[PDB]
Amino acid sequence: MGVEIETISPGDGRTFPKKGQTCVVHYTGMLQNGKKFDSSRDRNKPFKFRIGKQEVIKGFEEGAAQMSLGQRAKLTCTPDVAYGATGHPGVIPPNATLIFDVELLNLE
Amino acid sequence: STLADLLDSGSGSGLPFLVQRTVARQITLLECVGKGRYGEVWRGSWQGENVAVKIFSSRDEKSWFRETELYNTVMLRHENILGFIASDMTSRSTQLWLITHYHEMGSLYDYLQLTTLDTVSCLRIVLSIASGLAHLHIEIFGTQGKPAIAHRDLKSKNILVKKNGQCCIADLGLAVMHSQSTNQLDVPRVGTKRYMAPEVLDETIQVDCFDSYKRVDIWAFGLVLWEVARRMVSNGIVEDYKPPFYDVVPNDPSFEDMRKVVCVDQQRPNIPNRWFSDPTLTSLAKLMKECWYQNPSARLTALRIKKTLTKID
């Protein structure tokens, strides 16, 4: 599925994101070489996206949907569930696998 | 709540990178306000506020790429450079979106067509364009800095009129960047033909010399200056809107058309006699002429034009 999840610290092991819920996360995104490209932590502002509304790359949502409330985890996303062959100009190169350190802060 | 809040820490000009997708998918397209070979520009809405969405034709994928890259790698916020919000790819074949501040007055080209200008507005327009172009052209070092940028397709259609009476420069898809991380310039005759400097038309430009590209922009800016000054009233008199070289080339001119006018015949737009009875238009005519020297090295810098326009005002 191009999304591998490596737990860093557990969540409540009970509350997982459901359709239509707003996921509230902190994330730090890096390329495979470790270079950081985006970080909600650096801006001190949590990122929010609605489950099932396609408001984030497929890999990120798929990984988050497997996390329970309060969990923190490393999501590795292959290009086919991220930005593909084009990438995102000036940020993500072609065929990039991306690593996100994600914390699921809340579900609203 | 508002897009301004979301914009109010890191790098690039617009929304945080992952947030660009989120906002782009939350946008509703309302009406097409522009259509061309570039693709389309639409008015759209995000949570009840207007934004502009440029949807690129597949012929222009490379401009989307370059413009997106520039805005995402350079901090390019400035009153007179079109404000970038986000870029997104969306399968709808994949569509390429560039999302920006919406300006309901449209382009300077359209505005000049059925409006004439008082002195205040003429000066505000041309000063604002100069301010934007100087900001593009100048390299700023340090953590709050930017590389120098040359636009390469400056014209009245690629400038938008803002409600406060200033303009902003848009359409950075052909632009080139110059920094200290100086490899070769990443790029010959790419722009709009009617606005091409002699050295573009005869291909004498040294393609690895950034300065040379700035001087090409200055030629085109002189032409924009002329377009605008024609529409300023003096002593009850004004000229109709015309594009540069309207009297000697056809619509959609060829390279050969332009080369013959600009290089071989050394022609320049004519200054109407009525301008010499007005101190502002007299100063603008002088300024124009100093953007149109055949020798690029003699042309004024954007910053010099800005400072001069600041003293006429």
A36 touches chain B (CB under 8 A): no
User: Residue A48: beta bridge partners?
Assistant: A24
Are the C-beta atoms of B226 and B112 separated by less than 8 Å? no
Which is nearest to B126 in space by CA: B181, B80, B190? Answer: B80
User: Which chain B residues are Cβ-neighbours of A29 within 8 angstroms?
Assistant: 17-18
B35 is in an annotated binding site: yes
Secondary structure of B253-289 in the HEC alphabet? CCHHHHHHHHHHCCCCCCCCHHHHHCHHHHHHHHHHH
Burial class (CB in 10 A: 0-12, 13-18, 19+), A6: exposed
Q: Nearest residue of B to residue A51 by CA position?
A: B22
Q: Which helix (H) or strand (E) element contains residue B26?
A: none
DSSP state, residue B117:
B
B93 touches chain A (CB under 8 A): no
Q: How was this structure determined?
A: X-ray
Dihedral in degrees, nearest 10, Cα atoms B107, B50, A43, A40: -110
Q: Where are the beta strands (DSSP E) in chain B?
A: 28-36, 39-46, 49-56, 84-91, 94-100, 148-150, 159-161, 167-169, 176-178
Dmax of chain B from CA atoms? 58
Tokens 């100063």 correspond to B283
DSSP state, residue B124:
H
CB contact under 8 A, A56 and B66: no
Tokens 């902003």 correspond to B168
Question: From the list B19, B26, B68, which residue is nearest A47 (CB)?
Answer: B19
Which is nearest to B7 in space by CA: B101, B70, B143? Answer: B101
Q: Which helix (H) or strand (E) element contains residue A75?
A: strand A72-77
CB contact under 8 A, B21 and A57: yes
Cα–Cα distance for residue pair B202/B186, rounded to 1 Å: 21
Which 3 state secondary structure label does DSSP give B78? coil
Q: Which residues contact B107 (CB under 8 A, 6 or more apart)?
A: B156, B157, B158, B159, B160, B161
Cα–Cα distance for residue pair A100/B197, rounded to 1 Å: 48
B234 touches chain A (CB under 8 A): no
User: Which chain B residues are Cβ-neighbours of A43 within 8 angstroms?
Assistant: 9-10, 16
Dmax of chain A from CA atoms? 39
B22 touches chain A (CB under 8 A): yes
B39 is in an annotated binding site: yes
Q: Which residues contact B268 (CB under 8 A, 6 or more apart)?
A: B289, B292
CA distance A9 to chain B (A): 24
Residues in chain A: 108
Q: Which helix (H) or strand (E) element contains residue B210?
A: helix B210-229
B92 touches chain A (CB under 8 A): no
Question: From the list B18, B64, B94, which residue is nearest A56 (CB)?
Answer: B18
Q: What are phi and psi of A26, to 5 degrees?
A: -105, 145
Tokens 């809340």 correspond to A106
At B142, list the tokens. 């340090």
CB neighbourhood size of A25 (10 A): 23
Which of B107-123 are b and which e, b meaning 16 or more Cβ less than 10 Å from the residue's Cβ? bbbbbbeeeebebebbb
Q: Which residues contact A69 (CB under 8 A, 6 or more apart)?
A: A11, A12, A14, A15, A16, A104, A106, A107
A27 touches chain B (CB under 8 A): yes
Contact pairs from chain A to chain B, CB under 8 Å: 62
C-alpha distances (whole Å) from A95 to each of A58, A81, B156, B170, B253 are 15, 10, 38, 30, 41
CB contact under 8 A, B21 and A55: yes
The per-residue DSSP string of B221-246 comes to HHHHHHHHHTTB-BTTB-PPP--TTT
Catalytic (active-site) positions of B = 153
C-alpha distances (whole Å) from A2 to each of A26, A80, A98 are 21, 7, 10
Query: Sign of the CA dihedral B133, B55, B162, B111?
Result: positive
B75 touches chain A (CB under 8 A): no
List the domains of chain A with CATH numbers. Answer: 3-107 (3.10.50.40)
Which is nearest to A8 in space by CA: A65, A63, A72? Answer: A72
CB neighbourhood size of B43 (10 A): 16
- Annotated active-site residue A16? The verdict is no
B161 is in an annotated binding site: no
Q: What are phi and psi of A79, to 5 degrees?
A: -60, -25
Which amino acid type is present at position B223?
L
User: Which chain B residues are Cβ-neighbours of A60 within 8 angstroms?
Assistant: 18
Q: Which helix (H) or strand (E) element contains residue A3?
A: strand A3-9
DSSP state, residue B146:
B
CA distance A15 to chain B (A): 24
Burial class (CB in 10 A: 0-12, 13-18, 19+), A87: middle
Which is nearest to B17 in space by CA: A87, A107, A4, A79? Answer: A87
Interface test with B, best of A35, A55, A75, A83 (most B CBs within 10 A): A55
Cα–Cα distance for residue pair B240/B99, rounded to 1 Å: 33
Are the C-beta atoms of B27 and B51 separated by less than 8 Å? yes
Question: From the list A56, A60, A90, which residue is nearest B72 (CB)?
Answer: A90
List the domains of chain B with CATH numbers. Answer: 1-104 (3.30.200.20), 105-313 (1.10.510.10)
Cα–Cα distance for residue pair A28/B90, rounded to 1 Å: 23
Which 3 state secondary structure label does DSSP give A34? coil
Are the C-beta atoms of B232 and B116 separated by less than 8 Å? yes
B37 is in an annotated binding site: yes
Which is nearest to B127 in space by CA: B214, B221, B191? Answer: B221
CA distance B104 to chain A (A): 28
User: What angle in degrees, to the nearest 10, is found between the helix axes of B279-289 and B210-229?
Assistant: 150
At A106, list the tokens. 């809340």
Which value in Å is the resolution of this experimental model?
2.2
Cα–Cα distance for residue pair B255/B175, rounded to 1 Å: 21
User: Which chain B residues are Cβ-neighbours of A53 within 8 angstroms?
Assistant: 25
- Annotated active-site residue A100? The verdict is yes
- Annotated active-site residue A37? The verdict is yes
Which is nearest to A43 in space by CA: A25, A22, A65, A69? Answer: A25
Q: Helices (DSSP H) in B2-60: which residue ranges?
A: 3-7, 17-25
Among A16, A47, A60, A100, which one carries the catalytic annotation?
Answer: A100
